[PDB]
Write a protein that binds this DNA or RNA. Sequence first.
RNA 1: GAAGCCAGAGGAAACUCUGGUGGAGGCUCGCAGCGGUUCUGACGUGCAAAUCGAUCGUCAAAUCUGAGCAUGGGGGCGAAA
RNA 2: UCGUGCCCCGUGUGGCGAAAGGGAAGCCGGUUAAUAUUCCGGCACCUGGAUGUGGGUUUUGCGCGGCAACGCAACUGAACGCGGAGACGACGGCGGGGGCCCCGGGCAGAGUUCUCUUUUCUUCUUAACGGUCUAUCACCCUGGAAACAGUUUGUCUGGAGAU
RNA 3: AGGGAAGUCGGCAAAAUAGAUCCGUAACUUCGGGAAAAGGAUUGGCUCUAAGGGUUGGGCACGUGCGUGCGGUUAACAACCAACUUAGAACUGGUACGGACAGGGGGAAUCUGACUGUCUAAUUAAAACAUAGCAUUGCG
Lengths: 118, 91, 49, 76, 84, 95, 191
Amino acid sequence: APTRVTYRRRNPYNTTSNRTRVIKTPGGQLRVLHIKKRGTAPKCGDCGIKLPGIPALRPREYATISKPKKTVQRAYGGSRCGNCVRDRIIRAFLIEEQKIVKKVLKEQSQAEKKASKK
Amino acid sequence: SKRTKKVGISGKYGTRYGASLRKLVKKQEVTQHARYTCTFCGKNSVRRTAVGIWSCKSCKKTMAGGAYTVSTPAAAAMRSTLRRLREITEA
Amino acid sequence: RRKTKAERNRIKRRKEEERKRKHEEAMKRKQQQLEQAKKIAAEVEERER
Amino acid sequence: PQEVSDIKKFIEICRRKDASSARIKKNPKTQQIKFKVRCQRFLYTLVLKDSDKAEKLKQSLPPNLQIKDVPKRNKR
Amino acid sequence: GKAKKKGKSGAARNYMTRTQAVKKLQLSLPDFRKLCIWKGIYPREPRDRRKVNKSATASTTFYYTKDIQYLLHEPLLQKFREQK
Amino acid sequence: SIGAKLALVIKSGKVVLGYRSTLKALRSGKAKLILIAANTPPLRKSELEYYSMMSKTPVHHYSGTNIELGTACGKLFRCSTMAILDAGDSDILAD
Amino acid sequence: RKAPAKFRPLDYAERHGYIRGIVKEIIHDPGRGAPLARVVFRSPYKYKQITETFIANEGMYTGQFIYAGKNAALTVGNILPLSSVPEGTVVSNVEEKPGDRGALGRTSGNYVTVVGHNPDEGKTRIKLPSGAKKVVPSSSRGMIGIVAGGGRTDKPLLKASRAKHKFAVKRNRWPKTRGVAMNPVDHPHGG
RNA sequence: GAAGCCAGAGGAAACUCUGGUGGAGGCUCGCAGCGGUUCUGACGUGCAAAUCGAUCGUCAAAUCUGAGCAUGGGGGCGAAA
RNA sequence: UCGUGCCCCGUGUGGCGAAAGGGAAGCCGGUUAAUAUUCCGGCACCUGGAUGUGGGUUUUGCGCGGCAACGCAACUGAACGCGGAGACGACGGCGGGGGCCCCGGGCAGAGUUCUCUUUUCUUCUUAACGGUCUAUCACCCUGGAAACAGUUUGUCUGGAGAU
RNA sequence: AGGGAAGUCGGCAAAAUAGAUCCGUAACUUCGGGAAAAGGAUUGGCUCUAAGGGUUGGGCACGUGCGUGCGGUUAACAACCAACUUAGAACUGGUACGGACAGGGGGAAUCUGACUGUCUAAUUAAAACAUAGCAUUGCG
Ligand SMILES: [Zn+2]
Ligand SMILES: [Zn+2]
């Protein structure tokens, strides 16, 4: 039995675009099959973790699949992870509350200064 | 079980480069490959990433430090005199 | 409490058992539809009309 | 190629306009029968147990759809 | 062969807005409206106006590209320029 | 002073150690004191102060780190924040 | 190397108040012994953010707010004009003239000491890492602290490969053959 | 068989000893590759305007190598012959 | 409509340069004297465009479910912005998968057979493209751990929440 | 054959050594090495023995194949499956046992260059060059 194979294209060099895997055909022969590179999982923009629920594809493969497959039904879904979204929400609320508090204290200090001047 | 009497981490160099140079490089190698306690999360997971770059594995914080140690004594004395100068300027 | 390997094997065995029951019930509903195929064809005809 | 597990869906597929032809494959070793309909994009296969009602499904299939039985040898 | 790009064929080539028609003919708005009335250039409606222009609204006027091409050869344009 | 009071509270009264149990005590409203370490993350610290402000609970900012807070509690692990539910025989609440 | 290590251009915000930026990354720059800091500022005139590249001082970290301007605080990583700092402070990336975005005290472990002020003509006397004394305009900017990565040269290179790897990215000539090892046609010291 | 780690035996502790684990080094034997030390070697109008045989150096890197590109004689390039 | 104008924006500047870098998409069987992932048959895929049918949404106008990680055939989205992918070193051991190698049984065929050998050898295969059920990391919920625990060949992880 | 460097400018060339298991291994030393130092014992075949593994499987009381409330750590037991190493013993052939192939001669010193590396393609590979380390000069 012939178990040795050849490249099926004219590139003879083992580059990153020249990945092959061995298959057996219904004709009983061993053969190579040229395969594309593995897709990379999309990652969070804040912490850099892999985003769960999102497929790992080559960049132009994402144009052929629908919107709910490419995203998670949440704010920043498919771009940020849930922990980072929670941190963003809590940070935004607390900073706006402290902005209101600082504005109130500045108004009180301005009123006290005006009363001292008058 | 102690395997080498004195070379320690410098035993990878064998008999090359001289005893004095091996002793000089040993301290820098030890202090650059040691683990350090993080000043942000408190865990012992700060390791050198590059030249003067120290990253914590747990809290993912990256700090600018010395070449082979996290903090330089000159930088610490600088922080102390900066704190007292800032206190003098504000007061 | 921490479970035992026998309990894990029992859980697994129930999992393939319920998968096999789902497959058998799908075969049964396909056979029933094949039995009532003529009424199905008439209903498809009615919907298209 | 796509497999249809619903007789109603297979009936609608056979009544689609792009259904050019249909064929019946008999596997007596497995004791099964297969209805394969050739549409524009997909070949749709319905797999049934070999039975008289599976044979009578031909009568429910549309008349204008040219249906043929698969021979034992695929002569070129 | 070479893969086509989006938005380079179909309704985008078939229609243009009034602003694009005016800029193509290099006319003022009164002259453009006068020429359209005199030559019988009628407003049109694409099936999807976003495929023609992403900033189109319900009040956006569309014309045929071939109609504007026909308007490009009208001798009254030089009459307008001579009068100016 | 604060370390001795914390140690006697550990010996006599009731505490919970950690962020989630401290939040649970603040939500229950039975928390009598909250201690937050110096090296606590600022977002977590602000959230704990907001919870204590809503629950009317005093907050002590421990000048040590989480390691030193755990050591002052007498445990062999770090502790970013803690909640004292029962003062016991100490006067840590009267301050 | 992606971008040169420069300050922001001297604008209205740095000239009259301060502007806050956030340190996103601390990165290794090939050929340079000192780490760089990516700091993102706000554009006062448009919606888009502006990313800058500074020489990271020791103690800077990701997620830290730094402040650049006349009214910025005296804190490590803050960029201040030299007229706003007291005597005895050490600064980094000192501008020779106000607006050249940093020229002095840039290598690892190095700093410039503010010796004194002369407010009559707006001059500042500074001490360079070489021990030289210089007089600069007081509106020249500097980042408070010491450049990170000090003690780099205390470690022996110990290997020709390590010297080669050092100099290959720095494009300096290596190996170096001696002039006395040459022929008289090649070097004045030849022979 | 370097750091790091585990266990046992001592030491008030730092450390000491023993048995393992681990897999570092411009470390080492050595195949291919690259190179070219020796032989009264072959060959000497040769297979060859530098080849052949045995032997040898090196073999995880200051290792070997393709394509594209840059440096041009008053020059270039040169671990410098 | 004072009808022959007004408003918005800043980022710059073009081309060439890789049959080994990046990159949208094709597999199997057969066929010639000589070509074949190119021809023939079957079965697919990508890109772009136009416009229908079914289904979906909507009288609470632009979906519903799950505490959550998230899921489901759909489920509006211009300017202006943010992020991810493309997109990346060398070496060491460990684990999973395909292919190959090896062992046993069986059908069929071939060889050996002075003697022995229920013997030796050969065929026993399943592509792209899809459906469906599962696969280390990681993440979520409960709960709060010293008599510390879990854990890898390699000692890392845990009140910043482990088992 | 015998002798064993008596040959020759010169042990040039050849011969001898060689794998693996075990015993053992000096001076000097930058303590890392030297070191496979040196010097020794053994190796075939056959018939056995021993050691080193994996998978599955626990009794009651109720509701009804799962849910609780208990009870027990001799499963320290059974059933099935599985592959390659290591050690020990007897017997037996012998002129040979790493039976071909494959495969360090070793040691005492001196000079010399620190080492790894590089060059005179086509007569010179080296104490030459480079190297790390050290020292000096110039430049804000
Ligand atoms: Zn995130
Ligand atoms: Zn940390």
